[PDB]
From a paper:
A total of 190 041 diffraction patterns were collected from ca 30 µl of the A2AAR crystals embedded in LCP, of which 10 816 were identified as hit images, corresponding to an average hit rate of 5.7%. The hit rate was relatively low because of the low crystal density [Fig. S4(a)], which is common during LCP crystallization. The remaining images showed weak scattering patterns from lipids without strong diffraction rings. Of the hit images, 10 510 patterns were indexed. The indexing rate was as high as 97%. Although the sample stream was chopped by the XFEL beam during data collection, the suction device and a co-flowing sheath gas delivered samples to the interaction point without coiling up. The HVC injector with the cooling jacket successfully prevented any sample deterioration, including viscosity change due to phase transitions resulting from changes in temperature, allowing us to keep an almost constant hit rate during the 114 min of data collection. Moreover, the sample injection under atmospheric pressure did not require the addition of 7.9 MAG or 9.7 MAG to the LCP to prevent the transition to lamellar crystalline phases due to evaporative cooling. The structure of A2AAR complexed with [name] was solved at a resolution of 2.25 Å using 10 510 indexed images [Fig. 4(a)].
Author numbering: -1 to 208, 1001 to 1043, 1060 to 1106, 219 to 308
The structure:
Amino acid sequence: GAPPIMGSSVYITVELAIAVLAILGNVLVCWAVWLNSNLQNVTNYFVVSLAAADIAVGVLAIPFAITISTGFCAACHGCLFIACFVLVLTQSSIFSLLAIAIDRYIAIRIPLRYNGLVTGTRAKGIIAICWVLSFAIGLTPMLGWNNCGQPKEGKQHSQGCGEGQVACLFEDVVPMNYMVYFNFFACVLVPLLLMLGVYLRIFLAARRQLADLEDNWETLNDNLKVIEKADNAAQVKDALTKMRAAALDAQKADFRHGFDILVGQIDDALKLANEGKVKEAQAAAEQLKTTRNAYIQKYLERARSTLQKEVHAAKSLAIIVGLFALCWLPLHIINCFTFFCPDCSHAPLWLMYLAIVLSHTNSVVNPFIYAYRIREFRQTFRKIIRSHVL
Ligand SMILES: CC(C)CCC[C@@H](C)[C@H]1CC[C@H]2[C@@H]3CC=C4C[C@@H](O)CC[C@]4(C)[C@H]3CC[C@]12C
Ligand SMILES: CC(C)CCC[C@@H](C)[C@H]1CC[C@H]2[C@@H]3CC=C4C[C@@H](O)CC[C@]4(C)[C@H]3CC[C@]12C
Ligand SMILES: CC(C)CCC[C@@H](C)[C@H]1CC[C@H]2[C@@H]3CC=C4C[C@@H](O)CC[C@]4(C)[C@H]3CC[C@]12C
Ligand SMILES: Nc1nc(NCCc2ccc(O)cc2)nc2nc(-c3ccco3)nn12
Ligand SMILES: CCCCCCCC/C=C\CCCCCCCC(=O)O
Ligand code: NA
């Protein structure tokens, strides 16, 4: 077999390349939020917490990963910290992603109550709690759920470690039942499915409110034609009363002026209809068309635009969650095979390190998603680049 130093030279070189890109891209994200006040909102404070975790992958997790690949001799609990620190960062990322999804769900479901419920001070408290919990979850093996008590004696002496020390290799010290049941199923898979559900509910909420808007508009147009071809006064009254309710639920969901005019003109044409005079009620109802073409349509178009922007923004953030799953699932699935099929040959070492490298590349991608999908980030990236390096 080829000397190990050659394959490991490739692995280390790729890891360092990834580390550099992870640091630089995510520093740019934090720099962007710091300088641009329009990026300083609660949503982007979770983005920054996420960027901080990805910087930490480059500065600490990748160096740790290089170290533990050598199988060096170490006190088992020190090795455990080297092996598990990345799990703290991945857990922090999951909490940040989950918080962003819930944030966007609150924004679209109760926007009038959003800024009252979701504040920067409460968000900062949530970020601190999530980091603390990330340390507890990621370092649980250090509390005793580990195989430090059953060291591999052959590797210990073949590597020449003193006693009290282990050959520091991930799968020798971190139990597979922890990685599969606790880390993967409970701490990764369940939150991922939760976020899938929240984003589904976001798109459904946006679709329902768009439909409601269109319904109210066609209800105001349909009943206009009804009034224009009516003949009994009860006819005109029935239609006008269905326009008033439609006009009010649209009011809830200088346009306060446009609707005052609309409601007033409906009330006018309504009191005429109650008095029997229909032709003058129809005449009064036909001026609604200019209030509609002058105010209501304009507001219904920008309400449509706002929802479309929220949906497009929700899609961009959902892409972040999908790429997280794509980059981390292979390693988890491999662990499932190692754990659940003792009759299977272990995944080959080159595939293990490909899966590790892939998980680390996730710390590089998010800055690119922001620049391509989010105008405010893209433009802030441009200004920073063209001004502070050229
Ligand atoms: C930059 C600062 C904030 C963080 C860096 C701290 C890192 C380098 C420190 C903190 C704890 C340290 C570990 C503590 C215990 C051991 C066991 C020993 O047998 C080998 C070294 C080893 C594995 C240390 C490696 C270095 C280590 C991981
Ligand atoms: C998108 C998410 C929900 C997909 C997660 C599905 C994972 C848990 C599934 C997909 C393929 C499955 C593996 C397929 C084959 C085997 C071999 C069998 O001898 C042990 C179970 C084992 C190892 C399965 C474990 C569970 C597994 C890894
Ligand atoms: C891109 C993501 C979503 C899907 C990738 C699925 C990958 C991780 C799956 C597809 C085929 C799987 C391999 C199929 C066969 C074996 C041989 C067995 O003795 C060890 C596990 C091992 C080596 C599996 C490891 C996991 C594996 C490589
Ligand atoms: N199984 C596993 N192994 C490693 N590194 C050890 C790779 C290895 C595996 C077997 C072997 O004989 C020599 C080396 N890192 C790992 N990281 C993870 C992981 C992180 C998050 C989810 O899974 N799993 N995982
Ligand atoms: C400024 C950020 C500092 C970055 C710190 C990262 C440095 C790499 C950390 C771990 C390498 C040290 C572990 C090597 C122990 C080998 C001891 C031995 O010979 O057994
Ligand atoms: Na991350």
